[PDB]
Amino acid sequence: GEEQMRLPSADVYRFAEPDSEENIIFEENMGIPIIKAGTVIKLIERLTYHMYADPNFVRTFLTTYRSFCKPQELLSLIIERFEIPEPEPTEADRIAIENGDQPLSAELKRFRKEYIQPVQLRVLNVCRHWVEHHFYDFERDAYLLQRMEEFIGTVRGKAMKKWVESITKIIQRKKIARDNTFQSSPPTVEWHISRPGHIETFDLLTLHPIEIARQLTLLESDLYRAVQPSELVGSVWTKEDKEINSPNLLKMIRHTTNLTLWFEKCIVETENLEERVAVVSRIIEILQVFQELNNFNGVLEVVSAMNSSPVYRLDHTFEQIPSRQKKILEEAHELSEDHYKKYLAKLRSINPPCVPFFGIYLTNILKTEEGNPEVLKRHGKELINFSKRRKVAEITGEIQQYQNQPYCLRVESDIKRFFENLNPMGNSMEKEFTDYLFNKSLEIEPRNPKPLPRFPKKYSYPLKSPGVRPSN
Ligand SMILES: COc1cc2nc(C)nc(N[C@H](C)c3ccccc3)c2cc1OC
């Protein structure tokens, strides 16, 4: 047809081949069509489509492309997309040109205005979005940035120079940011037995339970806000380049692991029954203050430690926990039942700030990664399943909704360092450390036929909690 013949030939340009069932497919539409799957060449063509802007596809593609295309490869493909060949002059214009006259160039001017200029501006819009929302690709790869800067720095014409200046302004702002707010005063920092600065005495029962929950919420809020969506795409936190591709996500997971295991260690290593009741009761009070602060991540870290194999079996310890605290713990656990039905209602109704439970996002993303194929086959050809990536991107979009909710709480540097440097395992691996905790659990409360032994006290300081009500 006429529309296809005016486009460049396949022997001079790869992004102009006709659409077909074996190179691009779409979801049901009733409006910009939604791409279900396509080859990388068709995804690049639609990423920089001449007929209309597509901000949803650009956003989803730049968040998830690392699962099917390398950053260097994507830059080469969008640069290749930008370099469009122009049609040859018509016979009449060829005669005008050889006589030294100005050609009419009717179709040539139309191709430049309706195809070349829109595609080139779309390529530049992709570059701008890439540097604005995913500058980490350029921080990790200095050669990728040198290539980008050379490309934008050699684009000609005043119409595109304004776009180039906007891209450069972002790149420079990002480089400057690598180098170098409250309405009310935050509440008073709470202290119990440990005095400010006496970091040697810092522990679960010597620090104030209110301040443990506040500082852990500040720590977890910062860790939550730092996770970038691409760190969660294609299960990259479970593959070889995990440390480079998912640094903030792995830091969130390791804090959750270390805090949960630290709570369990505090419990099972407290061999005296009465002292262990005080330890468990103090962790429940920490959960209460996490609930007050809408730190659902912290509430469910306490629930995980209490449900763990070594702690959950301590019938004699929970027997002495007051009914009110046991009820608080049971309702916190019921937040997780029925696929987190009650947690989702609580999260939707609460007033910010909050720290959402991060584990549910990992669970849902892994379900989507394992449950959907990487590619779709149509007529014996493989197409990248883009709808799978879009489903993951929508879960990461929910994460981003709660990443702009700072707390009006004062940081206590020593308490912050104490929780950032938790190392319950020491030199042990996780599996061997959990086997240790379970054997310690069997020692302090042996299985039913065997009687319950007495153990000596380990804490010199008083065990009475100062409560969860502030002081002033
Ligand atoms: C069927 O399994 C369970 C059901 C559970 N129901 C409730 C209501 N609370 C659980 N734990 C919470 C944190 C708890 C409360 C009081 C004392 C100790 C622990 C459960 C744990 C389970 O397994 C580990």
Curated annotation (Swiss-Prot):
Stretches assigned to the N-terminal Ras-GEF domain = 31-175
Q: What is this protein called?
A: Son of sevenless homolog 1
Phylogenetic classification of the source organism: Eukaryota, Metazoa, Chordata, Craniata, Vertebrata
The lineage's top-level taxon is Eukaryota
The species is Homo sapiens
Q: What is the effect of changing W163L?
A: In NS4; promotes constitutive RAS activation and enhances ERK activation
Q: Which disease is it linked to?
A: Fibromatosis, gingival, 1: A form of hereditary gingival fibromatosis, a rare condition characterized by a slow, progressive overgrowth of the gingiva. The excess gingival tissue can cover part of or the entire crown, and can result in diastemas, teeth displacement, or retention of primary or impacted teeth. GINGF1 is usually transmitted as an autosomal dominant trait, although sporadic cases are common.
* Subunit (UniProt): Interacts (via C-terminus) with GRB2 (via SH3 domain). Forms a complex with phosphorylated MUC1 and GRB2 (via its SH3 domains). Interacts with phosphorylated LAT2. Interacts with NCK1 and NCK2. Part of a complex consisting of ABI1, EPS8 and SOS1.
> What the protein does?
Promotes the exchange of Ras-bound GDP by GTP. Probably by promoting Ras activation, regulates phosphorylation of MAP kinase MAPK3/ERK1 in response to EGF. Catalytic component of a trimeric complex that participates in transduction of signals from Ras to Rac by promoting the Rac-specific guanine nucleotide exchange factor (GEF) activity.
Expression by tissue, per the entry, reads: Expressed in gingival tissues.
Domain annotation Ras-GEF: ranges: 208-447
Q: Which residues of the full protein are shown?
A: 564 to 1044 of 1333
